[PDB]
Design a protein around this nucleic acid. Structure first.
Ligand SMILES: Cc1cn([C@H]2CC[C@@H](COP(=O)(O)OP(=O)(O)OP(=O)(O)O)O2)c(=O)[nH]c1=O
Ligand code: NA
Ligand code: NA
Ligand code: NA
Ligand code: NA
Length: 326
DNA sequence: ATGTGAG
DNA sequence: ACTCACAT
């Protein structure tokens, strides 16, 4: 969050390459944690060996910083930005279902764009094919006026099915965001607690129903606990049609509701801060259970929770309500 | 079982 | 950080 942006920019882009184009995940981590250290740094960096004093920045990662701070930018990130392969892997990556490995494989075979893909759906698995089919609007985001409209359609249909069901919309929404990427529903039913076995049925029935009233149109994956698929708000009579959205429905044990609604309402970075900044206090927060991390690596028997706050006050952390979670 | 993808 | 689902 400091006036060291440029430095951490090129650092982040340099990893988004080792991820997408190179083999390396460890190079991807090293470059990212380096971005992290420099971001929190109080001062403005004017040397390469000054950033090096930090843990995570080291010889080759600090040589490059000298370049950035000596001559404009970096040569490596120019050969990359001006490569056909790299740019195309990065493009393909943008369909859900495709990431690094498959893009590599596709670009190796001269497949590089939407038109390229549509003529080549044979190569894609089912997930990817729906990501394709709905590429345009999957990158579009969702207004609230329209977001609520779906909530009043999931809350209303899930209750008509069986009034014991509880649906709480999470992610961005709970954080108050004016715009969301994709719909996130945590589902809870009394019949299902942590001690009880499975009940895929409890999920699959609100799914199968949401399909019947034609609000869910596709499925990416559907299991015991989790459904990932595609929704779309009702075409208010012909043509002016709303775009297709992504939607998750997770089925949470009723007794571990609080832990679960914590895990959702992100961000994913807030979940990684809070989780890491717990393992110093020797705890292992889940989406299910907070629990002491004993002597060796043995994770002790859970921990009572009747509110998020309790998780918060377990790990000796200030409380931050859903809207300050990032 | 593992790798991959999404979360 | 830590899980879940898919496809070998
Ligand atoms: C990706 C990811 C997510 N989570 C949790 C935390 C949030 C929920 C849903 O997050 P989402 O990606 O939709 O974020 P959302 O807030 O909905 O952002 P958009 O509005 O979709 O952009 O998942 C996580 O723990 N680790 C992860 O790596
Ligand atoms: Na993708
Ligand atoms: Na979301
Ligand atoms: Na999601
Ligand atoms: Na943790």
């Amino acid at each position: 969050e400091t006036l060291n942006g440029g430095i951490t920019d090129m650092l982040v882009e340099l990893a988004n390459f080792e991820k997408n184009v190179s083999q390396a995940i460890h190079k991807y981590n090293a470059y990212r944690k380096a971005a992290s250290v420099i971001a929190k740094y109080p001062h403005k960096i004017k040397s390469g060996a000054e950033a090096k004093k930090l843990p995570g920045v080291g010889t080759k990662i600090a040589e490059k910083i000298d370049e950035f701070l000596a001559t404009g930018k970096l040569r490596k990130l120019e050969k990359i930005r001006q490569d056909d392969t790299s740019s195309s892997i990065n493009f393909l990556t943008r369909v859900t279902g495709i990431g690094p490995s498959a893009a590599r494989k596709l670009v190796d075979e001269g497949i590089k764009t939407l038109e390229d893909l549509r003529k080549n759906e044979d190569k894609l698995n089912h997930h990817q094919r729906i990501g394709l089919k709905y590429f345009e609007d999957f990158e579009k985001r969702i207004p609230r006026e329209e977001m609520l409209q779906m909530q009043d359609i999931v809350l209303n249909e899930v209750k008509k099915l069986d009034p014991e069901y509880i649906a709480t919309v999470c992610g961005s929404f709970r954080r108050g965001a004016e715009s969301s990427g994709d719909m996130d529903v945590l589902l809870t039913h009394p019949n299902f607690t942590s001690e009880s076995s499975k009940q895929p049925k409890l999920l699959h029935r609100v799914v199968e129903q949401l399909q019947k009233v034609r609000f869910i149109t596709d499925t990416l994956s559907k299991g015991e606990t989790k459904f990932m698929g595609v929704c779309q708000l009702p075409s208010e009579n012909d043509e002016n049609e709303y775009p297709h959205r992504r939607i998750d429905i997770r089925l949470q044990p009723k007794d571990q509701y609080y832990c679960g609604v914590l895990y959702f309402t992100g961000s994913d970075i807030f979940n990684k801060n809070m989780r890491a900044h717990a393992l110093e206090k020797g705890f292992t927060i889940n989406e299910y259970t907070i629990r002491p991390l004993g002597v060796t690596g043995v994770a002790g028997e859970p921990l009572p929770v009747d509110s998020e706050q309790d998780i918060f006050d377990y790990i000796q952390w200030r409380y931050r309500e859903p809207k300050d979670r990032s």
